[model samples]
Target: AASSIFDFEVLDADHKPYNLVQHKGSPLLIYNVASKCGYTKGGYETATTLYNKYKSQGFTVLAFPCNQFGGQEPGNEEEIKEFVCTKFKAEFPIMAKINVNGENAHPLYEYMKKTKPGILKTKAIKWNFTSFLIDRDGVPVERFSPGASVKDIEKKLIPLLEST
Candidate 1:
């Protein structure tokens, strides 16, 4: 049924439409981000490192700015992009601002939650920087909490990234 994450469509920070189909067959790391969170900068650095380490091998990180938590991501799309690029030297794509939880959450996220429910089978995202890993086949693979170290994720991700 809803096995493939490539079925969803969204927009980039530039307001350009991005159909997830174009990324099919590549491993994806999707994370909800906030510009002002204390952990945001570290998260970006880690994500950038991961992308740099494995991008040529078909791995990408999609950072979705969300103010839904503590209003940390207050800037508009452009500002958000600028902050990320200038501050963290991030090279990955930053998606348009989105609600990661509640009724207005993006359809793609809704599907992700339904595909791989989080801790104790709960669907609500706990906080910003919560990440999800998707396999090359477009299946939801694993979820990492906001506090999870990228190294922990990398261990699980490297095999998948190496496989295809």
Candidate 2:
């Protein structure tokens, strides 16, 4: 698996910076999520479940809100988090809003796109919710599209969790 997990600096719900490197030795599930998108509901729900299910085993989800998709998410960092948590009760790590594509796209994302480069193209994000699963070593093991469910992560995720 190839992933640049260390290249991103995510902000907590309060807009405070949170570096992925802080969890360098843990298995990370990086997700680009939205607030108004329907996919947000399902993805966020499943992600929370996965976190609660594996958090004790060193598995975590770093969810970032992106407004690039259908304007589904346009709120500030705190607002977006309030919506996700109030509506879906998502309990995982919900970071501040980020530009997941284009020039203003965060450099962390630039490295991610450069390294993973979607399925058949090296373009920007294709949808609202895209997921990259990184192993304990900070290497991207797999990419899950918008429609992919959180349970899809268990196969690769479980082994890493059980090992540590």
- State which candidate has the highest TM-score: 1
30 Cα displacement, candidate 1 (Å): 0.5
Tens digits of lDDT, candidate 2, 1-164: 32457755667778777755877788888889887887877888778888888888677888878889899888888788778778877777788788889889977676666667787876578888788888777777777788776567787777776665
Give the clash count for model 1. 0
Give candidate 1's error at residue 107 in angstroms: 0.6
Model 1 worst lDDT run, 10 consecutive residues: 18-27
Each model's TM-score? 0.95, 0.88
Q: What lDDT would each prediction earn against the true structure?
A: 0.87, 0.78
Residue 84, candidate 2: alpha-carbon lDDT:
78
Residue 138 error, candidate 1, Å = 1.2
Error of 2 at 5 (Å): 2.1
